[PDB]
C-alpha cells in the first residue's frame, strides 16, 4: 500500500461510483497516490466531486475537461501544470457511442456516430497523451481501458468495437512515440461487470470463463496499480486482459 | 481465364495504372470479369474513363463516387441497380492521409487529419457495403485493402496505421452483419510494391521469406481467388500477401 | 480448372472417402493435377488405391509412408524422385491424439501422449518438409491442415490444441526457411465437418458462425486449389480459415 | 514490500546469478514471500543452494526435480506439501534444446530433438501444474517464461520457436482447467537481456525498442511479483510483455 507514494494521477472519466474509473481511483489512492479528476460536462460536476471529498488526505482537483474541445483540454493540463508541477500519469476512461449505432446491425452505423465515436473514444487517447507529455517530466504511464470487442465480433458492440480497434492501435503507435521520454502506454481489456440483455451475457461469462466470475472495477483497478508503478517500468504498448480468462476461449 | 465468368465487380480507388485498384481491374478482367469503375473526382474522371476503356468497351460503366458524400454514394449504386441489376462484389481500395499527420509523429497527429483519415480509409468500407449489399441479390465478396502497419508499429505510417485498424475491425463486423445474407467480407493486406521508401523495399527483399516485394499482380490474384466461389467458405479473413514477411519477429 | 495442369502433387491422410485428405484431392485433380498418395499403413492401402482409381486421366502412384519413420519418410520421397522426378507442393493432412488423453482435463494428458501428438500431428510436417524440399526442385507449396483449437482454447480439443499451436508455429519457422528455395508454406484453418457431443458443435456453429452453415470437404479442396496455384505465389506463412467465418467471433 | 507476505512459492530453473528465474526469486523476496528452489542436475545442486542461502529470514528448502521424471516430480511435490502444507504459486521457468537443431536450418530439426524440447520446455509445465494443484489448496498463480520467438519467427530460434508456442498454448488450456479451482496461468514473454552473435540483437532493442533499452531480470521479476500478487486476480490465460515495448513492432 505504497506502490505510488509520492506520485501524482489524472484520472479522466468518473461519472459515477460504479465507474471503472472510479474503481482505478479507489485502487490508486489505496497505494498512496495523489489523484486529479476530470468531468465531462457540468451535470457530472457534483458526483466527482462528491466521490473525490470520500478519499481520505489532502482534497483533490477537479476540473472540466471536454476531450472533444481542445481549447479545454490544453487550458485543463496547463492549470494541473500550474497547480503541481509533475504528474507521473493518466487514467484515460473515456468512451462514448449513440444507442441507435448500437442497438442496429453495423452495416447500418451512421457516419456522424461512426465519427464521434472515433473522436470521443479513441482520439481522445492521443490528444490527451499530447498534453499529459507536457506535464510527465519523469516518465510514467498513461492508461486505457478497452473491450475484447475491439478484437474480436461481440454481439451489439459494433461501432464501439471498431472504435476499440482504433484505441488500441493508437495505444501501440503512442508507446512507439513516447518511450524515448520515459512514458509507457497501455491498456486494460475488462470484461463485462455486473454493476456497470446484459445478465444473460454475465450468466455466459461466470458459466464459461476460466474463473466462473465475471469481472470487478477493483480488479481493473489493481491491474492499474500495477501499471502505473515502477514494477511495469518493461511493459508498454501492452494489452492486459482482466476479463477472468474470457479472451483465451474459441 | 475463367473463374470469374459470367460476374460483375465494381472497382473503386482507381487514380492511375500504378493504382493497386488498376492492378486488381487487369486480374479480375483477365478471369473473366465484367467491371464497373468509380472515380474520386473530375480531376480522376479521365484517367479512369480511359483505363476503363482499355479494358472493357466505350461502353463501359463509370460512375461518379465520393465516399465521403453520402447523396452521390447512394446515386452511383442506384444507377448501378438501373443499369446492370446484380453485382457480384466491390473491390474497396480507398484511402487517404493528410501529407502533415504521416510526417510528424503519431502523437502529433491532428483531430481534423484523424478524423478525416478515418471517414475515408475506414468508414467508407461500411458505407459502400450499406450500398452493396442492395444490388448483391446473388451474394459475394466484398474487398478491402490493408497494410501491416494496420497491426504493429510501421515507420511514418502513424495516422493510417490506427485508420486500417479501424478498416480490418470493420471487415470482422461487416463479416458478421453480411454473411446470412451470402455476402462474404475479406482484405488483403499487401506488402510494399514498388510500382524513404527504397530502402523499405530492399529490407523486404533482404529479409521476407521469398526475398522479394510484392507485385500489383500477386495482390489481383488473390483478389481473384476471394471474389471466386473457391473461397466461399473464407470471410472475414486478412490474407498477407506480402512475401512473407507479416511471420517475422 | 486448369489452375493446376502440368503440376503433381502428393497428398498425405487419406483413410477413406470422407477424409479431408480425399476433398482436397478431388479438387485439386478437377483443377488439372496429377496426384500421389502415401497410405499410413497396411490396413489403409486398399482404401487409397481403390479412392486414387476412381480418377480419370493417368494412373496415381499409391506409396506407404508411415510419418513417424524416418527409413520409411526417406524410401518413399525417394521413388517419388526417381519415378516422377518433380513435383509441386505436398498436402499434409496427418494429425492423431489418443482418446484417453482428448476426453480428460488438459492438465491430466499423459507425457507419452502428449509426445505422440507432437510427433505425429506437428513435427511430421517439418519431417515431410525435409523430404519434399529435394524434389520440389521448381518451388511449390507444402499445405497443413489445423483447427482453432491451435489458437484459442476449443472444448475437447485439449492436446490436439497445442499440438496444431506446434504445427501452426512450425508453418511460419518452415515458411522462413524455404522461401528463398521458391517454396511457401501455409496452413488452412478449417471449421468442423459433418460427414463428445459433436452435432451440437455443429448446430453452434450454423446459429452463429457469419455465414450460417457448417464447412464442407470441398470448401477445403478449393482453399487448397488457390493456395498450390500460381495465384497464390505472393503467400506465404499464412493461416486462412475456412470456417464460415467462425474465427471473427468473440 | 509486502505485497506477498505470508506467501510461498516454488522457483524452477535456477542454473546461476544470471537466471531469471534467479531474479524472479529476488522480486519475489523483496515482496515478502518465501521461496522453494527446486534444481535439475546435481551439477545445479551447488549454485542453487548458495543463491538460497542467501536469502535473509527463511530456511532453505532446495530439491531435486527432473521434471522428465514423474516419481521424481511427484515425489518432490509431496515433500513440499509435508514441509510447508499450502503453496501459493510456481515459477516455471524450465527451457532446454540441442545446439546443433538451434544451429542448423528449422527444416533439418531431429525428430529426437524436437521432442526433446517439447518434454522438456512445454509439456512440463503441465506435469507441473499437476502436481501444484495438490498444493495450492488456497488458490494462486502458475507462471512460465516465453519469448516472441513462440508468437513471430525469430532467427536461430528455430526447435525452440515452436516450444514455446506449444508452451503458450498450453498456458490457455491450463488456464481453462485450473481457474475452477482459484488457481491462475500466465506467461511472462522477456525480451532479450544482456546478461543471457548477441550484441548485434541488443544493439537492434536498443535502437527499436519504443523504451530504447533492453530488458532486465529484474523488470522480469516485478512484473512477476504482480501476476502472483492478489493485484492480479483477475488475470489468467495471458502473456504480458517485459521486452521494453520491442512486440508491438511491425
Ligand atoms: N463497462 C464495461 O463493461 C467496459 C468494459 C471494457 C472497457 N470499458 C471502458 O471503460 C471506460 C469507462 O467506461 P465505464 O464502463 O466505466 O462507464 P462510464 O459511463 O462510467 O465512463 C465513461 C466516461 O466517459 C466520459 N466522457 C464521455 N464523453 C466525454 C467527453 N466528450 N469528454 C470527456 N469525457 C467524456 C463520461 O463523462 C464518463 O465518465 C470506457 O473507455 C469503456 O469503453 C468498459
Ligand atoms: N501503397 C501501398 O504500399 C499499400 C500497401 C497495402 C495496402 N495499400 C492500400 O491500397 C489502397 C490503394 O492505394 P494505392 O497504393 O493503390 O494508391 P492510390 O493513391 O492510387 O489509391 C488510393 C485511392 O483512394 C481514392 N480516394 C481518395 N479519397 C477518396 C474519396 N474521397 N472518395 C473516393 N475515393 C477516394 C483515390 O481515388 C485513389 O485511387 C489503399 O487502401 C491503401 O491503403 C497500399
Ligand atoms: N476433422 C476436422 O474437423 C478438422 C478440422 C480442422 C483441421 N483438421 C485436420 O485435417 C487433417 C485431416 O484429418 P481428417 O479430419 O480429414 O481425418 P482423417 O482421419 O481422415 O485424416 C488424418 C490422417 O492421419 C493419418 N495418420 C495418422 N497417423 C499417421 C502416421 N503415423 N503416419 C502417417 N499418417 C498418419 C491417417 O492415415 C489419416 O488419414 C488433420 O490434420 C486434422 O487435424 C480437421
Ligand atoms: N534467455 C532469454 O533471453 C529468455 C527470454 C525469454 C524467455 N526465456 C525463458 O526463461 C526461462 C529461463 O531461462 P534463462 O534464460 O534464465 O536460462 P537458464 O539456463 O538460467 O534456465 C533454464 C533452466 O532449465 C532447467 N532445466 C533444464 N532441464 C531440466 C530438467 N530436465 N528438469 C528440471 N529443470 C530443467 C535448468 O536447470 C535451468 O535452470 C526459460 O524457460 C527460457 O526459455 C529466456
Given at each position: 500500500m505504497?506502490?505510488?507514494?509520492?506520485?501524482?494521477?489524472?484520472?479522466?472519466?468518473?461519472?459515477?461510483?460504479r465507474?471503472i474509473?472510479?474503481?482505478?481511483?479507489?485502487?490508486?489512492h489505496?497505494?498512496?497516490?495523489?489523484?486529479?479528476?476530470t468531468?465531462?460536462?457540468?451535470?457530472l460536476?457534483?458526483?466527482?466531486?462528491?466521490?473525490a471529498?470520500?478519499?481520505?488526505?489532502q482534497?483533490?482537483?477537479?476540473?472540466?475537461?471536454?476531450?472533444?474541445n481542445?481549447?479545454?483540454?490544453?487550458?485543463?493540463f496547463?492549470?494541473?501544470?500550474?497547480?503541481?508541477?509533475?504528474?507521473?500519469?493518466?487514467?484515460?476512461?473515456?468512451?462514448?457511442?449513440?444507442?441507435?449505432?448500437?442497438?442496429?446491425?453495423?452495416?447500418?452505423?451512421?457516419?456522424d456516430?461512426?465519427?464521434?465515436?472515433?473522436?470521443?473514444?479513441?482520439?481522445?487517447?492521443?490528444?490527451?497523451?499530447?498534453?499529459?507529455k507536457?506535464?510527465?517530466?519523469?516518465?510514467?504511464?498513461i492508461?486505457?481501458?478497452?473491450?475484447?470487442?475491439?478484437?474480436?465480433?461481440?454481439?451489439n458492440?459494433?461501432?464501439?468495437?471498431?472504435?476499440?480497434?482504433s484505441?488500441?492501435?493508437?495505444?501501440?503507435?503512442?508507446?512507439?512515440?513516447?518511450?524515448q521520454h520515459?512514458?509507457?502506454?497501455?491498456?486494460?481489456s475488462?470484461?463485462?461487470?455486473?454493476?456497470?440483455?446484459?445478465?444473460?451475457i454475465?450468466?455466459?461469462?461466470?458459466?464459461?470463463?476460466?474463473?466462473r466470475?465475471?469481472?470487478?472495477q477493483?480488479?481493473?483497478?489493481?491491474?492499474?496499480?500495477?501499471?502505473?508503478?515502477?514494477?511495469?517500468?518493461?511493459?508498454?504498448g501492452?494489452?492486459?486482459?482482466?476479463?477472468?480468462?474470457?479472451?483465451?476461449?474459441?
Amino acid at each position: 500500500m505504497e506502490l505510488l507514494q509520492g506520485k501524482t494521477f489524472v484520472v479522466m472519466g468518473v461519472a459515477n461510483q460504479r465507474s471503472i474509473a472510479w474503481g482505478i481511483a479507489r485502487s490508486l489512492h489505496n497505494a498512496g497516490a495523489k489523484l486529479i479528476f476530470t468531468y465531462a460536462g457540468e451535470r457530472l460536476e457534483r458526483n466527482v466531486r462528491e466521490l473525490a471529498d470520500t478519499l481520505e488526505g489532502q482534497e483533490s482537483l477537479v476540473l472540466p475537461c471536454d476531450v472533444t474541445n481542445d481549447e479545454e483540454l490544453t487550458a485543463c493540463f496547463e492549470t494541473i501544470k500550474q497547480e503541481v508541477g509533475t504528474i507521473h500519469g493518466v487514467a484515460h476512461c473515456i468512451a462514448f457511442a449513440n444507442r441507435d449505432d448500437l442497438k442496429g446491425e453495423f452495416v447500418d452505423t451512421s457516419r456522424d456516430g461512426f465519427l464521434l465515436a472515433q473522436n470521443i473514444s479513441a482520439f481522445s487517447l492521443t490528444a490527451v497523451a499530447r498534453e499529459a507529455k507536457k506535464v510527465m517530466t519523469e516518465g510514467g504511464n498513461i492508461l486505457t481501458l478497452t473491450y475484447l470487442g475491439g478484437e474480436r465480433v461481440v454481439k451489439n458492440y459494433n461501432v464501439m468495437g471498431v472504435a476499440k480497434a482504433s484505441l488500441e492501435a493508437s495505444v501501440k503507435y503512442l508507446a512507439n512515440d513516447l518511450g524515448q521520454h520515459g512514458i509507457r502506454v497501455n491498456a486494460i481489456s475488462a470484461g463485462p461487470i455486473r454493476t456497470l440483455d446484459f445478465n444473460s451475457i454475465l450468466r455466459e461469462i461466470e458459466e464459461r470463463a476460466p474463473l466462473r466470475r465475471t469481472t470487478t472495477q477493483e480488479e481493473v483497478g489493481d491491474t492499474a496499480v500495477f501499471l502505473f508503478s515502477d514494477l511495469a517500468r518493461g511493459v508498454t504498448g501492452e494489452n492486459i486482459h482482466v476479463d477472468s480468462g474470457y479472451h483465451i476461449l474459441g
